[PDB]
XYZ file of N, CA and C in Angstrom:
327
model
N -19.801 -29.951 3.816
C -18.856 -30.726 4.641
C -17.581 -30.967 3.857
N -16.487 -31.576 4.279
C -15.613 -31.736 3.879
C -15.237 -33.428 3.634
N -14.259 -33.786 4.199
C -13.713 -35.620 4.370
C -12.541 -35.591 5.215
N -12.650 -35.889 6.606
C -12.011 -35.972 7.678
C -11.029 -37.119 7.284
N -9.847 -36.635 6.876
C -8.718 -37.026 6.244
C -7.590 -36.139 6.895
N -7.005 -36.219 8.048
C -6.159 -35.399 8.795
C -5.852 -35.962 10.253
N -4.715 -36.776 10.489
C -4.199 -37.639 11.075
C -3.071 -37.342 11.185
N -2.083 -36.404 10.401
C -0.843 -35.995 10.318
C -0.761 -35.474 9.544
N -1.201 -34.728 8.951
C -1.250 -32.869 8.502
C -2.990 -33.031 8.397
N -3.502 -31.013 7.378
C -4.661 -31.036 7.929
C -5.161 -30.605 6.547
N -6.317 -29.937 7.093
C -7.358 -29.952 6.106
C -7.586 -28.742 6.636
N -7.350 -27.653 5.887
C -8.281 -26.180 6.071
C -9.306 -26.130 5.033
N -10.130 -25.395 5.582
C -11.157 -24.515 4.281
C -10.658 -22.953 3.932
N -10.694 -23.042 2.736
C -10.329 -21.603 2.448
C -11.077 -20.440 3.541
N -11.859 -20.344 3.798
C -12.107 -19.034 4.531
C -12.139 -19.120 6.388
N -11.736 -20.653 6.328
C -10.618 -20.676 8.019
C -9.165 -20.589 7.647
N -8.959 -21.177 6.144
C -7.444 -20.283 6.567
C -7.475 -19.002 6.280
N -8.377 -18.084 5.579
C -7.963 -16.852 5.921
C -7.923 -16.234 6.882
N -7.844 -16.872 7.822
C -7.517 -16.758 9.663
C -6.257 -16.650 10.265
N -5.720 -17.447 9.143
C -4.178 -18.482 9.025
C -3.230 -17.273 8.371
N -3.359 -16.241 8.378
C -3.000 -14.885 7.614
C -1.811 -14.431 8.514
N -1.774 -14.858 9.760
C -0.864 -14.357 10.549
C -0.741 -13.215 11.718
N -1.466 -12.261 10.990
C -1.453 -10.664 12.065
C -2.213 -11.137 12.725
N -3.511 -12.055 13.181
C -4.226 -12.523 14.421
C -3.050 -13.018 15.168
N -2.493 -12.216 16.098
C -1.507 -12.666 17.729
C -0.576 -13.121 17.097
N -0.182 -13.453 15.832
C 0.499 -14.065 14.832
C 0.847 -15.698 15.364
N -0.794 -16.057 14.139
C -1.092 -17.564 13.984
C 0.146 -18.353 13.003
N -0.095 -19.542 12.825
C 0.623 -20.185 12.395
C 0.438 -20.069 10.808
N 1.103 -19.402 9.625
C 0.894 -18.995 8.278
C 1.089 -19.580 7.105
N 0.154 -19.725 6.726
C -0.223 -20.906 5.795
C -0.605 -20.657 4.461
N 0.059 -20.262 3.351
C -0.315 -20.311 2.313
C -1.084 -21.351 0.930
N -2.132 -21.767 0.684
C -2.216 -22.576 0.048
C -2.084 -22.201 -1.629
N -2.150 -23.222 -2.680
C -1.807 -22.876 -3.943
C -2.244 -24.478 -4.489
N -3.973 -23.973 -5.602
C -4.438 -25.207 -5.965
C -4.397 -25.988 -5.027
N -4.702 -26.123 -3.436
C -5.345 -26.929 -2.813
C -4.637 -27.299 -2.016
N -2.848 -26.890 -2.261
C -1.667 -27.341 -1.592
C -1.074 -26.081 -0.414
N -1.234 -26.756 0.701
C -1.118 -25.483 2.060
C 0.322 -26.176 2.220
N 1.307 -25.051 1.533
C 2.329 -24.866 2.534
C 2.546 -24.081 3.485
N 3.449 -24.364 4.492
C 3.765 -23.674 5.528
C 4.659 -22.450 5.386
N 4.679 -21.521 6.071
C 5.089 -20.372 5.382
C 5.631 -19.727 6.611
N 6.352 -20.188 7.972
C 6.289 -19.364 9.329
C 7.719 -19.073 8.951
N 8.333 -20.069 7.904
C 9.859 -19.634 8.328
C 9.850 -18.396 7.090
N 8.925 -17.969 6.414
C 9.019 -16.830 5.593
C 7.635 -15.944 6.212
N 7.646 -15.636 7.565
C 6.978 -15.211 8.078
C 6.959 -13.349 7.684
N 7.632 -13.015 7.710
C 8.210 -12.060 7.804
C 8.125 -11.265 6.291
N 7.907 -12.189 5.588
C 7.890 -12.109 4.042
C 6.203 -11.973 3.958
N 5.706 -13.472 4.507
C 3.986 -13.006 4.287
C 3.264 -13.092 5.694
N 3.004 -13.045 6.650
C 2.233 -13.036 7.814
C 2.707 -11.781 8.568
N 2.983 -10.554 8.399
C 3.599 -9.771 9.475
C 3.394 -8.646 8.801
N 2.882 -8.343 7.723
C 2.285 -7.118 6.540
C 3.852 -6.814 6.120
N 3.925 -8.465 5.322
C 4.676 -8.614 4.256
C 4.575 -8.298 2.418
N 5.557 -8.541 1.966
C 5.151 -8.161 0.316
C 4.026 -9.060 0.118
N 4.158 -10.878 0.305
C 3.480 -11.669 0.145
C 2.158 -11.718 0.710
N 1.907 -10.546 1.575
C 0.620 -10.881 2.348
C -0.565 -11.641 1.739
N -1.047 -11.237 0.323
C -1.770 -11.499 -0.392
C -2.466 -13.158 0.129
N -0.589 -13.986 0.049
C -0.579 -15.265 -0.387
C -0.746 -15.605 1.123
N -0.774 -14.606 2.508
C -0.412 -15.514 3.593
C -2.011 -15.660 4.004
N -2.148 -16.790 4.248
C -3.556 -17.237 4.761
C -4.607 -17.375 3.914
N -4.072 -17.724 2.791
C -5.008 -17.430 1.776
C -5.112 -18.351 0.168
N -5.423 -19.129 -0.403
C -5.385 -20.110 -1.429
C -4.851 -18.940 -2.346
N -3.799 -18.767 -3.226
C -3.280 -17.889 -4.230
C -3.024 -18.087 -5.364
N -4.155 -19.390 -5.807
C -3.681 -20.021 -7.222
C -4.287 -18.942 -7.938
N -5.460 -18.714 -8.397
C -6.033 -18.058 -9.534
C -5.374 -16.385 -9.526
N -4.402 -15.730 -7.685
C -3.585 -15.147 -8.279
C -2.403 -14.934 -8.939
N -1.545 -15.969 -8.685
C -0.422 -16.522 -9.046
C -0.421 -16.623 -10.494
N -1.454 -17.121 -10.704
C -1.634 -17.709 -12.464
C -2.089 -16.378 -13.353
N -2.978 -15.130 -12.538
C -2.995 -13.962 -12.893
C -2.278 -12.917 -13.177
N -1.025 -13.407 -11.983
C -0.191 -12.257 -11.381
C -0.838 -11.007 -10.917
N -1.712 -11.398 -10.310
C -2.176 -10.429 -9.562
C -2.248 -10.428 -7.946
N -2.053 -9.071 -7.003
C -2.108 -9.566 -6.000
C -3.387 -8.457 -5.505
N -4.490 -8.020 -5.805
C -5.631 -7.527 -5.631
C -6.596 -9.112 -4.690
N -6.865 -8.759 -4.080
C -7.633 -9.672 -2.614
C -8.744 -9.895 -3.967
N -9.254 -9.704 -4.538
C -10.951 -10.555 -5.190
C -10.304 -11.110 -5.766
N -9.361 -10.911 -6.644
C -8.740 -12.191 -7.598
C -8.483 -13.268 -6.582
N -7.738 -13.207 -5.445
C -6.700 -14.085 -4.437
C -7.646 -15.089 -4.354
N -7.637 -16.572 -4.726
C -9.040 -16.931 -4.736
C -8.424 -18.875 -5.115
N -8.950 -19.542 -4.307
C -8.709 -21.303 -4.149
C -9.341 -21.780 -5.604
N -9.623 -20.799 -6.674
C -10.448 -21.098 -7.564
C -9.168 -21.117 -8.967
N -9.321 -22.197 -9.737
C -8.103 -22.396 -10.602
C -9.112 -22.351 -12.021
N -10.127 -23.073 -12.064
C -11.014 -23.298 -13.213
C -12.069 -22.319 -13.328
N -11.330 -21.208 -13.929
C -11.618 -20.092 -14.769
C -10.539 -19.358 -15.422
N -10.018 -20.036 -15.939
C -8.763 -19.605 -16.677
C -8.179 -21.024 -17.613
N -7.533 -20.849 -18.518
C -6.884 -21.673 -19.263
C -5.567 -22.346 -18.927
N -4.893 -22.838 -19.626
C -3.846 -23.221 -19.838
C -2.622 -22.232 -19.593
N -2.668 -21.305 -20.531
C -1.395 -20.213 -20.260
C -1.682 -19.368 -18.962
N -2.873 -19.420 -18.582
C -2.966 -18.660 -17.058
C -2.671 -19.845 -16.024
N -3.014 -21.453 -16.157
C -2.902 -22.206 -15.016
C -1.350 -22.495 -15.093
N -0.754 -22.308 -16.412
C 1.487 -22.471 -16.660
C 1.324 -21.259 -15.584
N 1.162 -19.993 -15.382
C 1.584 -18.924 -14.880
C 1.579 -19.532 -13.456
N 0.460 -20.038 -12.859
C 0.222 -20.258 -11.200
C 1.122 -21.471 -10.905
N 1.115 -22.283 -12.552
C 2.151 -23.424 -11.963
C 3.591 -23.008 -11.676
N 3.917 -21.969 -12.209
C 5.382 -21.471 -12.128
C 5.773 -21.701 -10.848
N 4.646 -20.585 -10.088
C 4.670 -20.583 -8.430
C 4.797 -21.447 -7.630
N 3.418 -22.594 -7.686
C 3.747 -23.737 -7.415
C 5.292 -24.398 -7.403
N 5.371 -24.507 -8.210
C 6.880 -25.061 -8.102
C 7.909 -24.146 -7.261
N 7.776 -23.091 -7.382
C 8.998 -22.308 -6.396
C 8.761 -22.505 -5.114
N 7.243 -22.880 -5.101
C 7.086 -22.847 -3.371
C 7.541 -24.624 -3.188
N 7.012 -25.154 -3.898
C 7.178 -26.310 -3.669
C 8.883 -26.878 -3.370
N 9.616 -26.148 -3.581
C 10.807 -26.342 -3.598
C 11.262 -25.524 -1.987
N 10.478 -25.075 -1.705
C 11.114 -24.407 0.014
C 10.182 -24.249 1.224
N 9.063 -24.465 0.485
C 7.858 -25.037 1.767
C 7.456 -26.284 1.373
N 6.688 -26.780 2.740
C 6.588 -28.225 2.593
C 4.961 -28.179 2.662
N 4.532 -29.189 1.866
C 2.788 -28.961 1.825
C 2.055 -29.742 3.433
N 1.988 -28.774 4.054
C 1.525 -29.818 5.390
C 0.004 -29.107 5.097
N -0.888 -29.781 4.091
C -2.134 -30.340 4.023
C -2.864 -29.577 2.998
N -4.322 -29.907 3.103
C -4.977 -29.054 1.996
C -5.732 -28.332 2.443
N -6.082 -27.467 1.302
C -7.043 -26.659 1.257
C -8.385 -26.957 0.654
N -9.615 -26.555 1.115
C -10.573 -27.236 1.124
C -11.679 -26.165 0.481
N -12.830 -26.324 -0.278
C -13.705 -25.794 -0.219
C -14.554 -26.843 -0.750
């Protein structure tokens, strides 16, 4: 289960937002990163539409971000298996997104 905490933004689980990917009828695209789902429709085009970013659209992208990798088994809501100089790498990201998407909720597992 989760903790029904979503009243004004939400709560995905990682493998309902990989639903959130976009090419389904093109859903609403949602990238999360360490737990943080930003919204991603106004860079739709970039990741929901078989964009460069696809990797990241619908999908938790910390442990790739922090990898730099964009191979789908890495792409993964999972941060704690890696260190320090790999979690600076995903934080980089974090911050860029954080600066042009807005976190409307989390990601859950």
């Amino acid at each position: 289960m989760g903790h029904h905490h979503h009243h004004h933004l939400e709560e995905f689980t990682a493998e309902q937002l990989s639903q959130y990917n976009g090419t389904d009828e093109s859903k609403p695209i949602y990238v999360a990163i360490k737990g943080r789902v930003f919204d991603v429709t106004t860079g739709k085009s970039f990741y929901g539409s078989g964009g460069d970013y696809s990797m990241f659209a619908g999908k938790d992208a910390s442990r790739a971000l922090g990898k730099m990798s964009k191979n789908e088994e890495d792409v993964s809501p999972s941060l704690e298996g890696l260190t320090e100089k790999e979690i600076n790498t995903l934080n980089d990201w974090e911050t860029k997104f954080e600066a042009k998407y807005p976190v409307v909720g989390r990601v859950v597992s």
